[PDB]
Amino acid sequence: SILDIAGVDDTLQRLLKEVWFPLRGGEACEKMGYRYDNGVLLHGPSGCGKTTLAHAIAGSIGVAFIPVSAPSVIGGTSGESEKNIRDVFDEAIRLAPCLIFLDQIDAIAGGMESRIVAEIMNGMDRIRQNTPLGKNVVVLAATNRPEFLDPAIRRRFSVEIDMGMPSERAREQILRSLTRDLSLADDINFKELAKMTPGYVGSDLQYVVKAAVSESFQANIDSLLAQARAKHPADHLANVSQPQRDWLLLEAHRDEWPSTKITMEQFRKAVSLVQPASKREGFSTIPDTTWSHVGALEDVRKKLEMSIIGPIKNPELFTRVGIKPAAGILLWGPPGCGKTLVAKAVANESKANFISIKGPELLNKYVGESERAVRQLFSRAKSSAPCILFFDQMDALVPRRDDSLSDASARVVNTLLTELDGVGDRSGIYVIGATNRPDMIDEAIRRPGRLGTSIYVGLPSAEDRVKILKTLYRNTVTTDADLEKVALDLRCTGFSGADLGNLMQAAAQACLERVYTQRQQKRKEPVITMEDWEKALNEVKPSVKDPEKYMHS
């Protein structure tokens, strides 16, 4: 029924004046004298409720309904396939007004295959001819891939309804509708559930409800397991893991549940267990790096927490002062200074979806597939907004368009430039680029709308290295007073963040050599001491020999 499908208020508004009206109020069109050749097409992400909606609407309109499944058209003969189609468009005309639902039209509208499309397209013209023009016949087609349709058919479907993905207000309606016949607690905040399910569709929200129901029965399974244990005194307790025993215990009886209700804590657990269909492929795991792993870089942190982390958490607070919820940032500086570190901290501290591109990872040897990967990269970034796109070592993906560029990477630079233009100010996509050679990256990528924000990550100062060395040593376990002396030592003049990490590793290795000799003069716990830092400072040199090169770009 209509009550069972929610969150489609915009879609149900168009279907009222484009499907319902020329099926029940055709007399007004007859008085107006206007033929209805509108072919209504339903398209959107898979799982948005196209098939279910088209059957709930069909049952509500009340006119004759002819469900058509594309695989069921084929009967076993080349000529029999047209017989099934010719028995549909004739029946609808004979029983006008009528509704035709061509579910999964692209399965037979992408020999026998080339003749079904011709029969389908001719059958729509007969609808316009063999009708009183006051009893319209509407053909409704649903497909999640509108681009696979034959242009001879998609041209005949003037009305196209893009359901799209539900918004926060719409997802709240779906969640309330799904949890309508269930027993619920009082802590369930459906508005909070809608906030933390971005990129979800109706099917994904159905899994979240389904996941929470299983959690509500977890307590009813442990009690069932305990009864089996009490019946078998110490059975299969050796050489069998606990999960294996649980299957064996429940397999024994197979012959012999209190009605509890779902709480709010189980709904939060359910959301984590459910991976939305938009995130099944193409998304990277959230990095384990936090802001506690990033030492100093307060200036870079403030810019990142005000352009990316900020707008994601409070999209309304920032938009009041003219801060749009979308940014393009080009981190640049000498190598080893933390461009990738802060980008991994932003991806983890923003709680948003993350896509990482490792240099020229999108290039493909076939024609067009290299550019389609770039376009598909921004297609799934929009569907899972907010999303952070991190282009690491971006100088290899958008090189300077010199004479020595070939007509293969230029076609990718142009595609990437256009996709960055298509990213709106309120889209929710935050693109981060990192490169240590800004003189090899195209100057067209730094225009506004594109990566027009540049953040320079450079070598730490003497006071800055103290924060970084304390950060590195803290996350691996000398105290803290000695760390200031080590980092402020003049031998660390050009040390970057990586060099300080190399310095700590050298001290750790120097400890083990001392430990190895320590255990030979006693036999015959390793702790990094201050004397280990003394010989680590001597044998570690800065990696960035000429820092001026990396900042003169």
């Binding site: 076993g76 003969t77 040897k365 076939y366 024609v367 070939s406």
Partner: peptide, 24 residues
């Protein structure tokens, strides 16, 4: 009718990299 497995063609059209030479 019997459905048959048929052999067909493809477009492919791979793109290859090249090496150039420069003057002094």
């Amino acid at each position: 009718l019997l459905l048959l497995l048929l052999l067909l063609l493809l477009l492919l059209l791979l793109l290859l990299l090249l090496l150039l030479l420069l003057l002094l």
